[PDB]
Write an enzyme that holds these catalytic residues in place. Sequence first.
Site, PDB file in Angstrom:
ATOM      1  N   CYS A   1       0.822  -1.205   0.000  1.00  0.00           N
ATOM      2  CA  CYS A   1       0.000   0.000   0.000  1.00  0.00           C
ATOM      3  C   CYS A   1       0.863   1.265   0.000  1.00  0.00           C
ATOM      4  O   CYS A   1       2.100   1.201  -0.158  1.00  0.00           O
ATOM      5  CB  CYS A   1      -0.821   0.017   1.293  1.00  0.00           C
ATOM      6  SG  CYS A   1      -1.098  -1.694   2.082  1.00  0.00           S
TER       7      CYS A   1
ATOM      8  N   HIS B   1       2.933 -13.425  18.873  1.00  0.00           N
ATOM      9  CA  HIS B   1       1.929 -12.983  19.834  1.00  0.00           C
ATOM     10  C   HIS B   1       0.542 -12.785  19.249  1.00  0.00           C
ATOM     11  O   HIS B   1      -0.444 -13.036  19.940  1.00  0.00           O
ATOM     12  CB  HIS B   1       2.358 -11.686  20.538  1.00  0.00           C
ATOM     13  CG  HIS B   1       3.602 -11.819  21.372  1.00  0.00           C
ATOM     14  ND1 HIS B   1       4.165 -13.037  21.693  1.00  0.00           N
ATOM     15  CD2 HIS B   1       4.372 -10.879  21.972  1.00  0.00           C
ATOM     16  CE1 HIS B   1       5.239 -12.840  22.436  1.00  0.00           C
ATOM     17  NE2 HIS B   1       5.383 -11.541  22.626  1.00  0.00           N
TER      18      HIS B   1
END
Lengths: 125, 134
Positions: free
Chosen positions: A61, A94
């Site tokens: 992007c 995580h």
Amino acid sequence: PGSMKVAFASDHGGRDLRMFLQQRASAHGYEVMDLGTEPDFAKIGCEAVTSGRADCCILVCGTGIGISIAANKMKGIRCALCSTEYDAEMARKHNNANALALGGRTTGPEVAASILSRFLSTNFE
Amino acid sequence: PGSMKVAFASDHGGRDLRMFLQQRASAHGYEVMDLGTPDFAKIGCEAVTSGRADCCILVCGTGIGISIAANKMKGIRCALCSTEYDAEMARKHNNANALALGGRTTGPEVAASILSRFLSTNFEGGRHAARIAK
């Protein structure tokens, strides 16, 4: 890595970097799903993941921020926007991220590549 | 600037940074709301969605998990920024009303200059307004 199907999509400005990243992914054994070049490339990258056709999608992007916002607003997507390898390492370990937003206007190619590389090789705890 | 209500929340490890960014925003005229030390994200975001704050600043480990969870809430647009340019685009183009910062990944002075650019940049609603969806 020969097992893992990796989808890529970019805006118009991000095509060059996307292809560079695809070629680094192929050269390290990943199965590349080039989803093409544009909203549009948003649903498209994320739907490859949610429908089981791809293990993760790499979205390239402007800054990555708009796309990370949109990607995360989709069910079953956890999109990490990373600017260091540590980020990408944590995104997986995580956060079990399944989408990586990268900003072509904000991140150098070699840095995007080392972020990609770490995202792809880190397992979720 | 004197008119803007900014909410702040952080994880356990993020209190130093939070307080530091709070002080900096106070001294540049912002109305600070310290909400305290993923409960703290729901809490930060709810100050925005209820109309009590204009935006919320969220100090996290990396910012990644918080930005994901924050973006899962309706009416929240959370920008994880690592440069002032990121912050500028998050407001200008993306209308972010939440800023995520990684206390473990971002230095205090860079975090303050990201915050300062986030708080002083306005959304470009005009150009987006007339874009045609579908």
